[PDB]
């Protein structure tokens, strides 16, 4: 019981956030059925139960809304510092540096407000540090938003400048709830690795944004939408499907290592995407994707995989009018709230972690300069 | 069924780059005896042994030294953006928020020999530049353009002080930094290995490394502060009584395993004695010496020796070092392990993704507003 | 995996003797509500429904009345041993060590299914007043089998003939003391009940564990605080000091009840009736003043004055010793434990569980010369 | 899971006292290889590591010896109190109720964790000895002042001093019965250990649960050994009991299944001891006959078989097994209690209600 090349699987501490059973396919968010919660709720009480531990009171919700509105403003000297940056480089590194922005912003108060205030502060702040950076990289100056819109509507208007209907708003809200949280991600793993050191929240969040990026950041669902665009026509996809079968690679958007029985996220995504394509019309790329999906369903019948939620998700992102390469910022936005709840929990534990390792080094040498 | 505390003693890897004894007071840096290396070896030779694997030859080392001097400039757009930098934050937090985008000078994401030594030399150079900058910047001083003529120790001393110092003190400081070029693999190194496998970019790596270098709310500084608060040898018995009440190891005394007068502290004490012989003994030096004699009159039999924190604070005071960045000075010394780790971290590539003890309730419902 | 730490909420068995519901303050003993069951009944019928489970007849009532009255004899060797007992101890430990050796009298099943029953039923108040007067050092006051159970207890323990109303109130209180939540008494009772050794050691361990938390009890500190009231006019200062102390209000607060468990309501009604009939004295006036002062603003918590506060007042009206309230409640507690043991005879099931081996491994023993 | 009548076998606490491995058959008392520890150890430092937790020094040993000697006497008033007991009950229950009263001696209610600890450690032996003497009726006397602990126990129980070889054997035997996994003893103890009050009611409830139904395995082992009798009837009675279809006595442990090398040490020590010291031949014949008779169950001569043998080699009282059983179990119970006291949690599990509802008072019952 002392062999772990790679140090994988050893459970660490007491889970306190979400109940999920991959074999059973049960999504009980803190014991609450994820589908049932998403059936009749909004992200407000969701995050309330996530970090605050319960859905708050009505007056509490109204006060939280008014306060988030109050702190929804923007900074000017920041824009001056922001004006001192380019508009072409690696957006992941750009946003990572943009994390340090809040560093000196309120660095002095290292309490109740230190708990209550800074949370909603980071909530109303991070979306600016992301979207304004995107606008600047696009060469577009910021605009002071109107306060008569939802936070999601606020971000949508900031990135789009249009007045939409709220059906797509509720759809995008459920979507944010979809990629919102899960069990311990490797990002969440390193977060817990740093969630105890009792230094500050800002530097932890910054290092989380940094290490959260995988190899070259990016990801798969972006490549999924890219391959959907590259699909074009699906008439020859059958020869392409056969060539890919001869290529020995995983079926795109199929067979999650944990989700293997078509976790309700994927099925709900497919159903809602069908409803949207019925309401607003189906795209020719959407038709090509549907044809490719039918061909795949008739192709293998042996992988046990299902069309992942990414099938609906890349399509919804493209149809909503979203830049292709911005997915990683959305992933960080989702992970921020989970990291917040995790750090709120971690505040209790005065664990003071420290590891130790094994040595396979040499010994008893004799040095020689100019070797 | 056991969940050991902090996974203390887990086989995360099989480290072969170094070793430590902890019983005979032997620390094997690339398997090298402390005194034998410390006799007459430049820090660059040990760095070449650690990073290049072997003590490099004359030609390649000279080429590296020339290229280092060939790349010791200060960016202009840096000072331009720096005009928007604040002037209140912690100096270590300052160094972090400063390095927050130091990598943006190159985003190649690749060549192989180049991004095995080029960004390496960039890191080896740019640190003291931004360090002395923030040092003068906090003072609101006009920035001074850099020059690679004086030795890195002497160059940094002149940059921070506008004064050419005696190089003997520079060599002593280099030796102390070698004694401080790292510690045992730290929680910094721990989180580094928690990120070192992906080999994405050394920039954010050393960034999060410096971020973790800050402890709980971010040794030598507090000990020196306590010594200054005490002052002379008149408060000896009251301080002893207060410490006995406090029931804690004497400030500047007590080690986890180095209960054998860890050789780093002994070497620091010998060097401090030589320096006080050369530089003279100050009233603070005499008072602290009397206090140390009084403490040794009580804690000799406990196997506990004065910690290197006091000697480091005394050296900084004699060097006239600002208090706010002695931790940044250590980071300048200590973060040198990042390069050797990355060189070792590049050897393998493994992904760790463990589970958690599910101490959360299993079944509940969805309450609408209740 | 998962482990709710150490016997917290896991349901044990589908027992059906009683039932407690906190939604509306429902106590269903054999499915019978307490409030209606207390109208015009005797504790004997309640004990029948509890242990025997069947409503008994008046013929058996007279028979058992004759039998138990014949079971009032005091053991002489018990008195001789008491002559060797100490003289400065704890009454609870006294009762424990006293009953600790009942096996000396009855020693070494189908017929012994009612013998020890009536035996222990009679044994309690006698030995109680015995140890009490034993502390006093006076000669014993032999009881009489012509007085009612409450009347006989009052006489023997007090050498005075009482009036009926206080005895009826005491019986009602014993009924209030009858049933509670799942008690560590009942827990350890069912625990030792798997051993199937003897009801004697069962009641023994029940007394042993039933001791107050660290030999300190809620009712003891409640009477202590009632004495600590002292003056009455300064209630506002002490109230503010305790508000600063932020403790569960002295004489207010349970662990699971916040909907006014009707036990306290009936206690308030009985206390009002008694203080109306009986002399109030300064105690009742100061208590009424302090109670009104406390109830002035504590309504923000949805609780009332605690039962133990009224228990102290009841003991004062009885002039009871401090430690007396412990066995006073223990009477009805062990009475319920009797029905618990009766139900415990149902099935044979003995646990032998495991735990989490939180330790190191592969150690070594070094020589003392080496050490 | 929890919906299992009885609710047994689930992990409960991250204990740091005992570690066992049945499949490996390795025993490590907080990391102590059983036989390897038994090679060159003494029970004193053993209990020191068990409860105190660390190996002590020699000066501590001398101080402990002097203190134990200082606190080794008994009370005459206690002896008089002992005379008041009746004489028709279980001697084990007798010893239990006897210890159940010691509170009138060192009650009180840092240093108030150690002195009464060693006092209760030295206490129960002479108490149970006088209890046995009273059950008989014969008058006992105070022990000597130069004997070893085992030597004192012998010069009390048999009122005579034997050699030290059997003393070391009994030292191993106590270590042989030193501890085990979480017993029902430990479960009930934790059930009663809630408020972390004191050893007084602790060892009390410990005994009060320690007894079993119907008033012992080693007792039943000796009964069957007497039933073994001569050589020729082993096969006939063995086949008759095979037709009876009963669990293989002297064998077949539900939990232990690797035939713990402690049992091997027991067999070897029995062989080494019987050589210096009859009916052992008849017992060995019965054992070999049963072994050749079963050959399929993997059921080997259990501990109690050799335990009764060692007791006969000492010549212990018939029901005296419960006494040694407590002498082993109670110390570990006390260590577990002292540990669990540090928790400060107060368990309070809630059961399942499957009762009736809506019942009203019958005017005629």
Residue numbers in the entry:
A (entry chain y): 5 to 114, 117 to 377
B (entry chain 1): 5 to 114, 116 to 223, 226 to 377
C (entry chain v): 5 to 112, 117 to 379
D (entry chain x): 5 to 113, 118 to 223, 225 to 286, 290 to 377
List sentences quoted exactly from the publication behind this structure.
Here we report the discovery of a natural protein, citrate synthase from the cyanobacterium Synechococcus elongatus, which self-assembles into Sierpiński triangles. Bacterial citrate synthase (CS) proteins are homo-oligomeric enzymes that can assemble into dimers and hexamers. CS catalyses the condensation of acetyl-CoA and oxaloacetate to citrate as the first step in the tricarboxylic acid cycle. Using cryo-electron microscopy, we reveal how the fractal assembles from a hexameric building block.
